[PDB]
Amino acid sequence: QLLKFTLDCTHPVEDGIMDAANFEQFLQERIKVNGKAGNLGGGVVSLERSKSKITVTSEVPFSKRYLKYLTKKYLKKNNLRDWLRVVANTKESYELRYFQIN
């Protein structure tokens, strides 16, 4: 069938602390399909980026928690995990938020 998930980086991007296009690029070559992260299984996984929302679609089984695994990996590579947090907004999406400090 189809599986659709979204990442909402609105709060950071509108604060200009992460280029969503770069994040889309990051998921482009890193997302794995049967152990390979090059061709996205041959378009079997499709990525779309909106203004501040990134979407992922798949024609095969895809784990929503994988996007959280990669999102956290990307946040760490960009030294953001100490300020941002990936929290499930709904059954189909995650969003980035700020820890309650000051």
Partner RNA sequence: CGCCGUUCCGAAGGGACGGGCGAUGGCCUCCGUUGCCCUCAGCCGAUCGAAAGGGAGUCGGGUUCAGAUCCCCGAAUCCG
Partner RNA sequence: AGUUCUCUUUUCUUUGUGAAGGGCAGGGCGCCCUGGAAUGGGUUCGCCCCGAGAGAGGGGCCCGUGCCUUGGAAAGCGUCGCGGUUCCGGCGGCGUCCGGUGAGCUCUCGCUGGCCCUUGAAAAUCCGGGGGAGAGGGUGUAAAUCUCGCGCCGGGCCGUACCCAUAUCCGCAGCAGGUCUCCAAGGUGAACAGCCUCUGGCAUGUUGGAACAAUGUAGGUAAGGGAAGUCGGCAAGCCGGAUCCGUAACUUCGGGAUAAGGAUUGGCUCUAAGGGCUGGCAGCCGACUUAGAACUGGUGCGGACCAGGGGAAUCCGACUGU
31 vs 29: CA distance, rounded Å: 6
Assess 100 for contact with another protein (CB under 8 A). yes
Assess 2 for contact with another protein (CB under 8 A). no
Select the residue interacting with RNA from 1, 2, 35, 42 (CB under 7 A).
35
Assess 99 for contact with another protein (CB under 8 A). yes
The DSSP-derived string for 19-59 is -HHHHHHHHHHH--BTTB-SSHHHHTEEEEE-SSEEEEEES
Listed residue (37, 21, 18, 20) closest to 29, CA to CA:
37
- Count CA atoms closer than 13 A to 41's CA, side-chain side: 15
| In the complex, minimum distance from the CB of residue 12 to another protein, in angstroms, rounded to a whole number | 17
Assess 34 for contact with another protein (CB under 8 A). no
Residues that bind RNA (CB under 7 A): 32-35, 62-63, 65-66, 68-69, 72-73, 75-77, 81, 85-88, 91, 97
- Contact residues for another protein, defined by CB under 8 A: 85, 99-101
